[PDB]
Amino acid sequence: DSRLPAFRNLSPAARLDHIGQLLGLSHDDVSLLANAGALPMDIANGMIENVIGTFELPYAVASNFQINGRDVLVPLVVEEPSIVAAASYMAKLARANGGFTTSSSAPLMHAQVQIVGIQDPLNARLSLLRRKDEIIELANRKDQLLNSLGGGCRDIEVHTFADTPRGPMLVAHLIVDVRDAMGANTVNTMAEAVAPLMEAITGGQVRLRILSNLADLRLARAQVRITPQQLETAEFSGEAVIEGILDAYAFAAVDPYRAATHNKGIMNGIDPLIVATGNDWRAVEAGAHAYACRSGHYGSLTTWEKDNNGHLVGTLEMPMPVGLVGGATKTHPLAQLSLRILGVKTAQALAEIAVAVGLAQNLGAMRALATEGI
Amino acid sequence: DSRLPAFRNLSPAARLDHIGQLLGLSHDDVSLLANAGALPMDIANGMIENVIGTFELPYAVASNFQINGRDVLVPLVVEEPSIVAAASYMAKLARANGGFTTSSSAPLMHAQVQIVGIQDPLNARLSLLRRKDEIIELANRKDQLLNSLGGGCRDIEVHTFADTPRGPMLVAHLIVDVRDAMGANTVNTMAEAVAPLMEAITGGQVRLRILSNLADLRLARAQVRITPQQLETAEFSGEAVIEGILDAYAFAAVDPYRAATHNKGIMNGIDPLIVATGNDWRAVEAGAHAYACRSGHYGSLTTWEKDNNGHLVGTLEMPMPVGLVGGATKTHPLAQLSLRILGVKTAQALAEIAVAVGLAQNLGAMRALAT
Numbered sequence A: 001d002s003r004l005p006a007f008r009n010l011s012p013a014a015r016l017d018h019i020g021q022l023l024g025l026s027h028d029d030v031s032l033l034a035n036a037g038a039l040p041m042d043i044a045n046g047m048i049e050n051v052i053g054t055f056e057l058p059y060a061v062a063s064n065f066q067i068n069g070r071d072v073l074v075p076l077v078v079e080e081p082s083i084v085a086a087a088s089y090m091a092k093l094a095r096a097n098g099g100f101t102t103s104s105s106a107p108l109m110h111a112q113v114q115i116v117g118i119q120d121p122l123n124a125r126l127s128l129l130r131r132k133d134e135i136i137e138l139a140n141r142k143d144q145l146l147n148s149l150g151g152g153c154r155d156i157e158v159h160t161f162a163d164t165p166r167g168p169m170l171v172a173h174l175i176v177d178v179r180d181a182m183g184a185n186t187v188n189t190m191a192e193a194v195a196p197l198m199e200a201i202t203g204g205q206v207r208l209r210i211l212s213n214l215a216d217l218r219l220a221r222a223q224v225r226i227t228p229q230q231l232e233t234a235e236f237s238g239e240a241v242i243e244g245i246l247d248a249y250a251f252a253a254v255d256p257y258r259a260a261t262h263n264k265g266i267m268n269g270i271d272p273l274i275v276a277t278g279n280d281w282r283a284v285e286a287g288a289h290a291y292a293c294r295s296g297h298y299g300s301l302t303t304w305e306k307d308n309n310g311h312l313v314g315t316l317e318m319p320m321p322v323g324l325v326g327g328a329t330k331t332h333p334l335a336q337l338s339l340r341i342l343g344v345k346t347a348q349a350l351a352e353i354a355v356a357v358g359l360a361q362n363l364g365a366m367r368a369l370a371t372e373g374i
Numbered sequence B: 001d002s003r004l005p006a007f008r009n010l011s012p013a014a015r016l017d018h019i020g021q022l023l024g025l026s027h028d029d030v031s032l033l034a035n036a037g038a039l040p041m042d043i044a045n046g047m048i049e050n051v052i053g054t055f056e057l058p059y060a061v062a063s064n065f066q067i068n069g070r071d072v073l074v075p076l077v078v079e080e081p082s083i084v085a086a087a088s089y090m091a092k093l094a095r096a097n098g099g100f101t102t103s104s105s106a107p108l109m110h111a112q113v114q115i116v117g118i119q120d121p122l123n124a125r126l127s128l129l130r131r132k133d134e135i136i137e138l139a140n141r142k143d144q145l146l147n148s149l150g151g152g153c154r155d156i157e158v159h160t161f162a163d164t165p166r167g168p169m170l171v172a173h174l175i176v177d178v179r180d181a182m183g184a185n186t187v188n189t190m191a192e193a194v195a196p197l198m199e200a201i202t203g204g205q206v207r208l209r210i211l212s213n214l215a216d217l218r219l220a221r222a223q224v225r226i227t228p229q230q231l232e233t234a235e236f237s238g239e240a241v242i243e244g245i246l247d248a249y250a251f252a253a254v255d256p257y258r259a260a261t262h263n264k265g266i267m268n269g270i271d272p273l274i275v276a277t278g279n280d281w282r283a284v285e286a287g288a289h290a291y292a293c294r295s296g297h298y299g300s301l302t303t304w305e306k307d308n309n310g311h312l313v314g315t316l317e318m319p320m321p322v323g324l325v326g327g328a329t330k331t332h333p334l335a336q337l338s339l340r341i342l343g344v345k346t347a348q349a350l351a352e353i354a355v356a357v358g359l360a361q362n363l364g365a366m367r368a369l370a371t
């Protein structure tokens, strides 16, 4: 049960105590939050290079979230007010109608291998595709463990660019199935091993061998339904507010100046969760915003409509390159704890929670804005 | 002097002591880093809503950075390794050729005032532009203090969209000159005050009154020059590395899949600094990335070229909606300290440092990739 009545009135120590009893945490865990210094300097000096101390940010916990029926507590680390309050309130509303409904695709990541110096990029492309099974097998031969976990390279796609400032180039894509890992190193490794062969097949120089942060093959999705009776303020009817939100949505879907702000609101709830779990927040931002203008125009990541029942329905589909076996998510005592609070077992389970927070957050911001909030 | 030889080998305590002696910090300041709990729970419980403690991240300091002749220590808060080492190393190289050269525009921010319900958006638009001085004066009448500091509303631009899923709409833009502030609240306020009059002039419903995070009027710029003799590794000649970097740049300039990654590398150095100074990192990311595809194609934020002298030149121009009088930058003991280490006096001075870090960072990653 994620509903915490009068939680925003309890003192921090009482809130911790509560979450402690609720989740049945050990004292060793509660101590990590009740006492500054959870991250020892000896560990902190190992993550970054010229460490001189530590920087603190508030570690909150949103309430009311319900994902696919199960309740869950969402830990968020951020410095801006109203985010947790709005995420939580909006989550409260979604409850009556079934909470958030999520889904996701297999944890697929791209690995790009740039190849220059080819006089025949187009022919060369077909040479790679015919000896495709060969390359794939050479890639999986390296990361054997991964294959046992149920991951590994699954397919290859080659794209050519014949109109580049530095001549034509060929770009092969390794579509690797990482696993509960963000996939930066697993993918970058396969790209390095496969390189020698591709260079032999095509006859050109391999330049970059790196992953693409535009994980359009690793998407997380979320949905909500909000009844007009739920949004009814004092001077505004339930339906009049919905029309307001749709107006705001349409506005973002056509003007990039608003879209940027619209999408920032979304990340307002996603990033904090990512930082809380010790995940790279830059990778999610880059993938989120790069996906927004996939159709040649920077637009809305979410979508808001009114269904047959005159109910507000909203969606959010975006890349979620997140992980549980990552670098920092493992060494930071508090990050390990966040995952314990979340109760998530797969990276994708965590991704589904991240897009729900953001969807709730976008709705919260839009409601405030559409409610003539002066 | 920002050069710190053998800094990466010193213990944290000795690094802090050193930085302490260097900048001449008081013990009250050094204690904030040498001891956990700099941020008291009573303060931490006022920033956010359901606090239950604090989360810590490493607070490092990049070295060698030189901005317009003056040296500066850059504090960075992040969890990913090599960022600080790369930024520092790339800054070291930039030193020989003059360091980084920066500039910026006045701190201008947008305020959008969406208006719907008009049958004549196009005619309505001209009605606002004629009574434009009127609207601007009403806006500055609200924030008088700001006007005394040398900021305030400066102009107004109206844009129309007649092909929207929800009918035509008009969007007036307040081009406010915020000051040393991010401007979220200063702008949002003016937009609310001007709203009533616009609704009277045009005759439609005012919907959103909010700022735009795509601060394309508030740009920070940075430049570098890198000599082939400086990049010469063991098996790779200097010029062979440059060509490799240009190949990497071209690749990002044409393929969005690489561009996203290219730009992530950039924010890898900019965000840590932003978090360090207690600034909104989401706002900078949204503005950074949305600017990347201003020309209908998501591309590189930075540019890399080879000049007449066969030298590598790189640039970075992007929006930097940062502040010094913001909300958290004022209440967090360590954020206030970061600004003291930086030594910056204006928000734009800080913005010029952020783009230099990002530029250096992009170069560091690319050199690694092309090597």
Ligand SMILES: CC[C@H](C)C(=O)O[C@H]1C[C@@H](C)C=C2C=C[C@H](C)[C@H](CC[C@@H](O)C[C@@H](O)CC(=O)O)[C@H]21
Pocket (backbone or CB within 6 Å): A188, A209, A210, B081, B082, B083, B086, B261, B262, B263, B264, B265, B266, B268, B361, B364, B365, B366, B368, B369
């Ligand atoms: C080929 C290895 C890649 C470059 C890698 O992980 O290298 C590491 C370790 C070290 C070799 C040197 C490094 C130097 C600079 C960066 C801080 C980089 C990592 C940042 C990474 O997130 C950006 C890239 O993913 C995208 C891109 O922008 O190209 C780091």
